[PDB]
Amino acid sequence: KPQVTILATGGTIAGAVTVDKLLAAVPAINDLATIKGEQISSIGSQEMTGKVWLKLAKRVNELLAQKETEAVIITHGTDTMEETAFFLNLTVKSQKPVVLVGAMRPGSSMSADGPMNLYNAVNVAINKASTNKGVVIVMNDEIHAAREATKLNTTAVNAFASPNTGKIGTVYYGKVEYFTQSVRPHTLASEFDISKIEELPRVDILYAHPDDTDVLVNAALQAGAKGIIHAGMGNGNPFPLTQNALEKAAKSGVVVARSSRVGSGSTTQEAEVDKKGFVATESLNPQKARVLLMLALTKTSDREAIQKIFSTY
Amino acid sequence: KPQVTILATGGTIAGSAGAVTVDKLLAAVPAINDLATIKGEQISSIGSQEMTGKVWLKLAKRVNELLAQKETEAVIITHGTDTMEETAFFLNLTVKSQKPVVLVGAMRPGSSMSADGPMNLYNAVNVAINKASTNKGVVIVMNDEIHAAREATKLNTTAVNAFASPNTGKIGTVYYGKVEYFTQSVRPHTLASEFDISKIEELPRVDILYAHPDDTDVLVNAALQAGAKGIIHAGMGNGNPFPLTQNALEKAAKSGVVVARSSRVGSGSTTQEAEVDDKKLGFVATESLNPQKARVLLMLALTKTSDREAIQKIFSTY
Question: In which residues is substrate bound (chain A)?
Answer without folding.
Answer: 78-79
